[PDB]
Amino acid sequence: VKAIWADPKEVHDAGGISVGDRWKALANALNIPLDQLSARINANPKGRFIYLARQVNPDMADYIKKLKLPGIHLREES
Amino acid sequence: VKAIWADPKEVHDAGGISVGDRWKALANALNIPLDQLSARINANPKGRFIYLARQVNPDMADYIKKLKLPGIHLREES
């Protein structure tokens, strides 16, 4: 017989309880169906780096950064 | 002007891209509205321990464990 407990800090550090809304927001912003986005990210689950988009203008890139999605990163190009 | 990349291991470790379906599943398993589950978890995001349920049957507990939700734990009662 078990007790169930939550560690709110851990939920937060994984992106929050509603992080799903933000995954959808990433997909919509990039106009990549969520299923396609997920498939590409999950293809090699132990992988540490797969490109999503390139030459993304700051307006779209800042928006994506502010979603604060776990495992999502940006770098300058050129 | 940026490249956007994913880290598939960080994404998996956080519970995955479709974690939202499973947070909904947790709320259902606990027989509570998702909004109430969200409100309790969001109450203090730096908090480390809140009880979600007590004296939970072995099978229900195993279902919860298999949702693989970040920050959700089981402990044995006595």
Side-chain angles (χ1 to χ4, degrees):
Chain A
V1 138
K2 307 282 190 309
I4 311 291
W5 61 279
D7 183 332
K9 201 208 173 180
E10 288 175 348
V11 181
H12 178 262
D13 296 342
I17 186 163
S18 304
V19 74
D21 294 336
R22 281 172 227 112
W23 284 115
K24 279 171 209 308
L26 175 59
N28 298 343
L30 290 173
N31 200 56
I32 303 166
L34 198 60
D35 292 342
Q36 266 178 41
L37 185 59
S38 299
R40 186 181 166 79
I41 288 171
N42 293 349
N44 311 126
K46 278 138 183 206
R48 307 238 86 226
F49 196 118
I50 187 151
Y51 285 110
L52 295 183
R54 302 306 301 273
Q55 313 302 139
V56 178
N57 304 263
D59 57 346
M60 187 169 285
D62 296 8
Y63 174 85
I64 286 155
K65 201 223 227 298
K66 292 188 202 294
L67 295 171
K68 300 205 292 162
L69 282 163
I72 297 303
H73 303 267
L74 291 73
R75 69 137 214 263
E76 281 290 331
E77 254 151 345
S78 187
Chain B
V1 154
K2 282 140 203 296
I4 298 173
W5 89 87
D7 175 350
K9 186 184 146 69
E10 271 179 324
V11 174
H12 175 271
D13 282 358
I17 280 165
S18 59
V19 78
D21 299 327
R22 315 197 315 273
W23 282 114
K24 183 172 176 190
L26 178 56
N28 180 69
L30 287 170
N31 194 24
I32 62 170
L34 182 63
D35 289 338
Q36 167 181 316
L37 179 58
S38 305
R40 286 233 288 139
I41 289 166
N42 289 341
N44 315 82
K46 282 158 176 160
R48 304 308 313 278
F49 188 111
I50 64 172
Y51 277 118
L52 293 190
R54 306 296 297 279
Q55 313 296 333
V56 186
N57 287 7
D59 295 37
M60 302 170 63
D62 184 56
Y63 176 87
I64 291 180
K65 189 182 176 134
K66 298 203 171 195
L67 294 183
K68 293 212 166 296
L69 287 176
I72 296 303
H73 306 264
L74 284 62
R75 84 166 294 242
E76 217 196 291
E77 308 269 33
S78 99

